[PDB]
Symmetry: C3
Subunit: 682 residues, 3 copies
Amino acid sequence: VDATAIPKGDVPILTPENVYAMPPQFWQNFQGKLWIGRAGSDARQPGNQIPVFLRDANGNLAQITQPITLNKGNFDQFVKDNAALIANPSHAMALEDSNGQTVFNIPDVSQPIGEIPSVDDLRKTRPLFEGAKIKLKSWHPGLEVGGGEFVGSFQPAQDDQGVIFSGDGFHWRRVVDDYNRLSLFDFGAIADGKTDSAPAIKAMYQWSQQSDQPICVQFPAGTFFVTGCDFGEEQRRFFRISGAMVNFGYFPATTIVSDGQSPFVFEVSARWVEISNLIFNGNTDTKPNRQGLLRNTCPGGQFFRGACLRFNNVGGTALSLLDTLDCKIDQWYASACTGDVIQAGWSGQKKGNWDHSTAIELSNFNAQHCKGGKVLNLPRCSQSLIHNGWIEHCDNPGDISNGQWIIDALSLEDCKNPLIAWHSRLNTRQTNLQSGSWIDNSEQGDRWLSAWEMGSTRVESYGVAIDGSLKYNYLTSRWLLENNTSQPVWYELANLYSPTVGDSWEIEVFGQSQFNNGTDSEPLMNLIDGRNTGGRAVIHVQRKKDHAEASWSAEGSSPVLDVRYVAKTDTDTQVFIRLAGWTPSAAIMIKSTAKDRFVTGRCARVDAKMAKATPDSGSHAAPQRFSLHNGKAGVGANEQGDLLLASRALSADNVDTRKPEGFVSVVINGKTVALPYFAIKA
Amino acid sequence: GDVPILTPENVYAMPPQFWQNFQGKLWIGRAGSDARQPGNQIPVFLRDANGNLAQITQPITLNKGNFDQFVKDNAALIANPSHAMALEDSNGQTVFNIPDVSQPIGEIPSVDDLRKTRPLFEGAKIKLKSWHPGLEVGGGEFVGSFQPAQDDQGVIFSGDGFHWRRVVDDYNRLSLFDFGAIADGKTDSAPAIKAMYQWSQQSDQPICVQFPAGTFFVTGCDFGEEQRRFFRISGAMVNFGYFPATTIVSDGQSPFVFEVSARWVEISNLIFNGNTDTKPNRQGLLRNTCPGGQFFRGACLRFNNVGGTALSLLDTLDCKIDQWYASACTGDVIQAGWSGQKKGNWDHSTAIELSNFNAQHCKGGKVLNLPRCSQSLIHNGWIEHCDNPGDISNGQWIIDALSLEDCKNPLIAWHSRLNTRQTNLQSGSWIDNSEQGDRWLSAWEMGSTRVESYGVAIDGSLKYNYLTSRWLLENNTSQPVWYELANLYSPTVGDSWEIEVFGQSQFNNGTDSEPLMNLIDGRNTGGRAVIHVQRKKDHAEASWSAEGSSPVLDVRYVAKTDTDTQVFIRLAGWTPSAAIMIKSTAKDRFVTGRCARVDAKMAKATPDSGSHAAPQRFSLHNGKAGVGANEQGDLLLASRALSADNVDTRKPEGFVSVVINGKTVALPYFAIK
Amino acid sequence: ALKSVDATAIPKGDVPILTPENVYAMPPQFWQNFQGKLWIGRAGSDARQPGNQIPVFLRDANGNLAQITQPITLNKGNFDQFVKDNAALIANPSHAMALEDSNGQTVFNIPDVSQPLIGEIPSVDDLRKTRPLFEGAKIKLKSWHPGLEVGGGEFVGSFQPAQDDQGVIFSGDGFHWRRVVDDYNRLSLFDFGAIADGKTDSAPAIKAMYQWSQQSDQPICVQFPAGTFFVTGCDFGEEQRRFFRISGAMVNFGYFPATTIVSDGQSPFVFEVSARWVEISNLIFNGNTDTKPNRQGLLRNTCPGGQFFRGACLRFNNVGGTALSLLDTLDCKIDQWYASACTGDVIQAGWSGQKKGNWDHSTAIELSNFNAQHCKGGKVLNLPRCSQSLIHNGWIEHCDNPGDISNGQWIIDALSLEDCKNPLIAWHSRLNTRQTNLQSGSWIDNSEQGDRWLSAWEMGSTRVESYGVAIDGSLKYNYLTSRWLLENNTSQPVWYELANLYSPTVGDSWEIEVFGQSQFNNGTDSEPLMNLIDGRNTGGRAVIHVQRKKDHAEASWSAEGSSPVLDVRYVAKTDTDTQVFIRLAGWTPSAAIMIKSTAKDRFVTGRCARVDAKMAKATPDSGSHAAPQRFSLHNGKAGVGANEQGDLLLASRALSADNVDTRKPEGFVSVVINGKTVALPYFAIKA
C-alpha cells in the first residue's frame, strides 16, 4: 500500500515505546488478538475494524488484516524493525488473550499500567487511551528520584518539565496529591552538587507562576549546583525559594553552590519575596568571585522575608534589596564573607518618595570573620529594629547612617572598624562592645533628614545617655534619709570614686528639718534658725592633686548641721553628714563632672552606704561656706561665721563723710535695725 | 433475621476485569464452615425489582450474562448476615474461602456509593476514588466492618448493618477534603468543618479542623455554647507569612463564621474575605465566648473586606497575634472584652501581645478594640489610612515601633500605662494618652514613659545615682581659653535657656587649711557658672553669674538670627573638668517638628569681633528685698527705705563682724525709734 | 529425589538459599494456586538449559540431607510439606535461578541472584529470617512489631554485607533488607521499633535512631511520632559530638505538644548528651514526682568548650530533677516553655572553669513566652553569671523560688512574678527592665549580697516603668525641659492652678521651680543693672517650697532675675492634698514647671506621691492661703535672706562696741541700694 493511500489525519497510535512501557511478563508470555476499531462501538464487532497500517523504519506502509496477533515473536519483530501502527487517533481498541478473555474493551480511546524508566522515554510513549496510568521510575535514567504516577491524555498541554510531559499529540500529567510537596527533583534537579539545577529551578518557577501555585521554587534536602538564574525585567507578585522544610534552627538540610560567574545566583523582580532554609557556599576562599545569593530589582515597594540562612565564603553581596517596605531576616549566620551580607538601597523615584528603606527587622544573627565588605549595608533605614545580634572578628560591621533603629542586645567583638551610624536615630539597650569595637553615631558625612530630627538615646544598666530633651513630673532620690528624733544623727552618705584628678561632685541633700505648722504665723527674722518652709544642704567635693577636699552650704531650714569627709585614696572619698533633728525626709541628688561608664571602664561611682555611722578620728571637717557672685562683686559666708561681702572699694576723698545720707530697714541677726549709707561726692 | 448480603454496588466495587471475564461458582454456607462442602450450604433468596423472594440452587453460577441481568433488575441476594462464603472460577481454583465473614481488590467512585456497598467480609479492602463523584479529592483506602459504628462523615461511613473505616497512617494529615469539602469557593464546606470538629472532639485528636489549600465557602458554624477544652482551626500548613494558601468566603448572614467556646483557641494560615465592599454585612471570622479565662494564638492571618468584628475574645488570660493583616475592614479587627459586670474578678484582659501586623484602609470600626489590657505588648505594627486605630484605654502596654500614618482620629489611650519606643506619627496621626472618661485603676497607677531617639518624656518620677554631662571641657594650662559651647535654636520669641557650667577652676590642696576671706578668688572647693540666654523680640540677649571658684571668666554671644544664638565661654586657667548641663523653656520634638536644638560645638574658638559681651550679673530676691551684682562690679541691695526722722541718727546702736573684700571689718547699724 | 547425603559431604560455602519464610513471604494467592518448576543453576547461565543445573540438597525436619532432582516441582502440596517439615533447600549462594509455571511460561530467568512477585512480611523478626530470592528483590513489611501496623514499609533485599541498625537495615545470616526512604526527614522512632503505648521502653529505638543518624550524618537525629512514650535513661555521654536533635510530632500545636515522654525516675536525666549544638522541641515530659518522687530531669548536656541550645514548645509536668542542665553556654534560646508543679530546678546553666577566666559564665540566654506554675523546692531559673541575656513576656506564679540570675546582664520585658514565696535573686545583676509586674508580695532582690563576679565599675541596673524611671548609674541629656510650658502674652498678670500635690507622708517636701522670666523686650545689655528685682535683666525663675506639716501643708517662695511669678497662694484642705496657684507675671512668654520631691514614688509604695497637673487659668478661692515671699542663703552660722514684710535679712557674728573704733568709719565700698549708687560705711576692729 502507498503513501497517499492513508486517510487524512491518521497518526502513529502504537510504537516500540508501547512494547517497552508494559511489564516484562506481558511482552514475553502474552498471546492474544488486538482490534483497532471505529470510535463509539466495540472494535471486535462486525464492520467496526478501521484501516491499520504497519510502517517499518525504512518507510514500508503495508495495510495489516485484523485481528492483529500479539506474541513475543511479533513484539520482538515490531521493536527490531522500529515499526509503528498508523490509524485514526479517534478509534476504539479491544484486546483479548489466546483463550477469548477480554483484557480491555475501549469504544473510544479519546474519552474515559506498566513502568517507564525516564522523562526522555515518557515524552516518546503515546498513551493507549485517555486516562491510561503509567509509573515513571525516575526523572533521569535510573536515579530513583523525581518519579511518580502519571495519567495519559490526547488533549493539547505544553511540557513544563515537571507536572506536564508532552510528546507528538499527547502528554502525561503527574498525579499530585499535595501540590505543596513537589520539589526540584520533579523538575529534573539532582542532589549531586555538580549537575546544573538552574533549568529545573527556572522550570519550577514558570510552572508556579502559570498555575498560580504559591510553593514556587522548593529544594529537597542535599547539595545543589546552580548557575546564575535571571527571571529579570518582568515584575511578578511572588518569588518564594525554600530549602528542606525541617525545624533546623542552626544548619539547613539544603546547600547551594555555584561557579561565581553571575553577580547573583537569583536575579528576581517581585513585590513579595520569601527565602528560607538555605546554606549558600560562595567558595570565594578557594575560587574568589563577586557572586551573591539573591538580588530583588522590583522598584516602588518590596516586602522581604528571610529565615534560617547561612552565608559561607560569599564574595558578592549575599542579599541586595530595593525600595524595602517591610524586611524581616531572622536566624541568619555569615562566615568568612568578603562582600556585603545584608544590603538594601532605593530607586530614588520621586513618587512614593522612594529615597530610603522602611521596616528592616534583623534578629538572632551571627556574623563571623567577614573581611572586605559590610555585614550591614543599610543606610536610610527608617522604623527599623535589631534584636540579639553578634558581629565578631568582622572588619566592617557596616553602615546604618541616617536610619531610625531600635537596637536591643547588639554585640560587636574584635571588629577592626566601627559600625557607621552617622546621623542615625538610635534607641538602644544592652549594647555589648569588646576588643576595641564601637558604634560611630557622630555627625560626619551627609544628613538625609532635618537637624530637628537628629539625636539618639542609649539605655544601659550602668546609666542613660539622651542626645535630646528630658522632662519628668518630679525628680526624687533612690536614697531618702529620716531623723524622727530631736537629736542629730551621723550618716555615711557614700564613697565617691573620682577617676581623674580635679573631678567635682555636688551632693544636694534636698528637704528641710522641722515639719511643725505655723511657718506663716510669724514673719521670718532669723533666716538660719527661723520658721521657714523649704530647705536644702549643698556638699561640694573635688579630687585635688593628692586625695580630695570638701565644702558645704545650705538654704532655709537646713537638713544638715555638719559634714565630715575621709579621703582614704587619691580616687576614693567617704562623705558623712550630721543629719539635723526632726528631718522627716531628705533626698540625696548628685551632680558630677567625672567620666561615666559610656566614656571609660574605670569610671565614676557613688558607692551608696546611707547607713548610721559616726565619722572616725582623722576625718576632716568640711568647712561651712557659700559664695554667690558675678566674678566682680557678690555675697558669701565663712566657717568662722562671718558674712563675706565683695564690691568696688571706695576712696574716702569721693565720700561726703559728714553724716549718713539715708537708711534702709535690715533685720541683722534677730533685730530690725537701720543700715546706714553715705553720699558719693560728684 | 435475614438481610441483603449482595447488591448491584457489589458488582460495581470489584475490578472491571471481573465483570467482563470471570466465570465461577459462588457458595453461601453456615458460619464456622467451608461453604464449598456437602451439608454446609444455607438457603439463598434472589430479590428482583418488583420481584418475589424465590430461591437459587447453589453453587450460584457467575458470568457476564448473570452480572448484567443482576444489575439490570436492581436485584439482591438475601441470606443470614453471619454466613460462610467461598468463590471458585470454573477451573475449580479458590479466589476466597471464608469460614465466617464476621471476623478476619475494588475501587468505588463516591461516599454515596460507599454507604450503599455492603462489604463481602469483615476486613474487606476498597479504594475510595474521591469523597464526591469525579473530583479526584477526599479519597483513600477503606477496611469494611459489620460491627455497629456511627457515620462521622470523614473516617467512618455507615450503611444498614455495615460501615467503612478509613485507613489513616497519620491523623495530622487529615483535611476537610476527607470530610467532604470542595475547594471551589461556592459549595458550603460548613457540614465538613462541623463533621471534622465533632470527630476531633470525640476521638480526642488535637489537629481539630484543618483546611487544605484553596478557597472555601463557609456558612456560619455555631459550635454550641457548651465549654470545650480546645478549638484549633488552620489553613494549608506551608511557611508563607504573607499570603496563606487557604481563603474563606461566606454569605455574611451569621455574626461570625466560627462561634466557639473553648479555653485554648488557635487560628493560623487563613485569609477571610468578608465581601462588605460589594455585599455590605456584619460577619466576623471567629468569636470565643468561653467564660472564666481564654487563651488565643493567631499567626499568618489576612482580613479583607470584613464588616463584622474579625476576632472577638472574652476574659483573655493570654493572647498572641503575630503576622496579621487587615485591608478595607469596616468593622472592629482585634476586639477583647470581659464578663465581670462589676470590678474585682473578670473586669479586664491580660497578656495581649500583637506583633508584625499591618491594618490598611479600615473605616468605621476600631482596628484595636482592647480596653483594660494589662501586662500587654505591641511590637513592629503599622496602622495606615484607618479612621480609628482604636481603644487601648486603661491598659498597660510596652509599645515598640508602632506606626500611625494618615489616621483620621487618634489611638484612644485614656488612663493607659504606656512604655513606648520609636513611635512613628505621620500625616496628622497621634496617640491620645489624656485623662478623659472613666479611670479603671487608682490615680497612683497612672503615668506613661516615652523613650524616643530625640528625647525621653516621663509622666512620673525620675531618680539617678548622679547627673553628669555629654560635654566635659578641660583647661590644663595657666592661660584662659575661648571655647564655643553650642548654637541654641529658639523656635518661639521669649524662649529662655540656662547653661550651667558645673565644675570649678583650681584643683590644688589646702582649700580647708585657711578660712575663706575672698568669696570670689579664695581657696574654695565647689563652683559653677550660670549663663542665661533668652530670645527677645529681635535676636537674643544674655547675662551670667558664678559660684565659688568659677570655671568661667567671661561670656560673649553671637545672635545674627531671630532663632540662632552661638554662646562662647572664656574657660578659666586650671579648670580640670567642666560639665555642661542645660535647662530650656523651648518646645522639644514631642511638641513640634521645628523644635529647640543644642548644636554642640565644644571647640576652641575666639568670639568673632561682632560677638556681644554677656553682662556679669546675679539677682537673688523674694520680689520685695534681695541681693545681687552688676557688670560694673557693685553689690546690689534691695530693702524697705527708711526716713531719717524714724532713726536715732547721732550714734550707731551696734556692729557685726563682716569680711568686706578681703579684710574682717565692723558693719554698723543705727537704731529705729 | 531420594539421595541421602551427609552434612560433611555438602560443598563448602553452600547455605540455605530458600526456607519456609520464603513460602510465607510469597503472596497467599501464589501459595494456594501456583503450579510450575524451579531451577537452581550455575551463576552466569540460564538454569533451565542442559548442563547448567548445580546440586541442590533438601534438608528435612530431623535435619537429614538428600540431593533432589531438578527441575523442582512447586505446588500447594509441596509448599505445605516444605513448611510442615521446617525444610530448607541448601545450594551455592552464588547461583542462577529460573521459575516456569506448569504451562512453560517463565516467571523469572535470573542468571545471577547476586546481580541486579512482591510478598508481605508481618514483623522484622520474620524479615531477619527471610532470605531474599535475589539481589534487589522487593518485600512489604506490614509493621515493625507483629500486629501493630506502625514502622512498616517497602524493603529491597541484598546479599552484600550491612550491619543491622534496627530501623533502615534489618540483616540475617548472609543477607539484609534496606528500607526504601524517599525523605529521611519523614522517618520516626516507629521505624526503629518504638511503641506509642506509654509502657514499652522505647530507649532501644531512641539509641538505634540516634546511632543511625550519627553514622549516616542525617540531621533529623531522634524524631518521635505523636503519642505517649516510656523512655529509660539514655546515655550518649563522654564522646563529644557536633549535633543532638530530639523533637516530638512536628505539627503546629501552640499550647500542648502531641508527644509525651514518661520514665521510671531511676536516671538523673532521661537524656545524657554531649554535643556542641542541641535542639529540643514539641515534647511534654511528665516526671511523675507527685506520685513516685525522684530527681530525673529531661536532658543534661555535658559537652565542654561551648554549648549552643534551642528549645521550643516544651512542657515540664511534675519534674523531680533538673528539667534542663546546660554547661559553658555560648547561645541558649528557650521559647514557649511551661513548667507545672516541678520540685527541682527547671532552666539550669553552669560553667566548667574554676578560675576567673575562659569558661566562668553563660552567654546569650534568651528565655521568651514562658509560664511557671506551683513549682516548689527548686529554682525555676538557675542561671547565675548570664551575660548578653534577655527575658521577654514570662510569668512565674505560686513558685517558691523564681530562682537565681545574680552577677548577670539581662534585658527583662514583661516579666510577671505573682504570689512567689521568695524573691528572684539578682545580686550584682546588671538589669535593663520594662513593665515588671510584681503581685502578692513577689519581688526581685537586685541588692549587693554575696560574691560580685565582675568589677564595681560594671555594676548598676536601669528600670524603665510607665509610672517612673530608676537609674542605678549615670544620667546625661542635651537639656532639661517641662511637660508643662505656661504662656502669658498679656501686660496683665494671670492666675494659674499648677497642680494638686499628693504627699503620702508627714514632712514630705516639694520644690516647684518656675523656670523662665517676665518681659522679652531688647536692651537688657544697654543699661548696667541697678534695680536687682524690676531692672532690665536676662534669665530668672520663681522657686516655690511646699512641705506637708503635722496637719495640712504650708508654702513659701523665692525668685531670681526677672521673676515669672508675682504672687503664690495654696489650698491645703486635707492632710495629703495641696493645690498650688501662681499669679503668672505680665509678658512672661514661656515658663517651664520643674519639680523636686522627698515623697515616696510608685517604686517604693502603692499609695505614692502624685502631681495632679491642672496647669489651667484659675483664680484661687478668697479663702486660699497666701505663700510668704522669703529666701535664705546661709552656711548655718552666717548668710543673707528676705522676709514677706520686704526687709533684707543678714546674719553674722555680733560685735561688742568696746572692740570697735567708733570714732570714724575706716573706709567705704560702692553699693547700689534701691537703685541709687551710695557708699556703705565700715569701722575698724581694735587689735
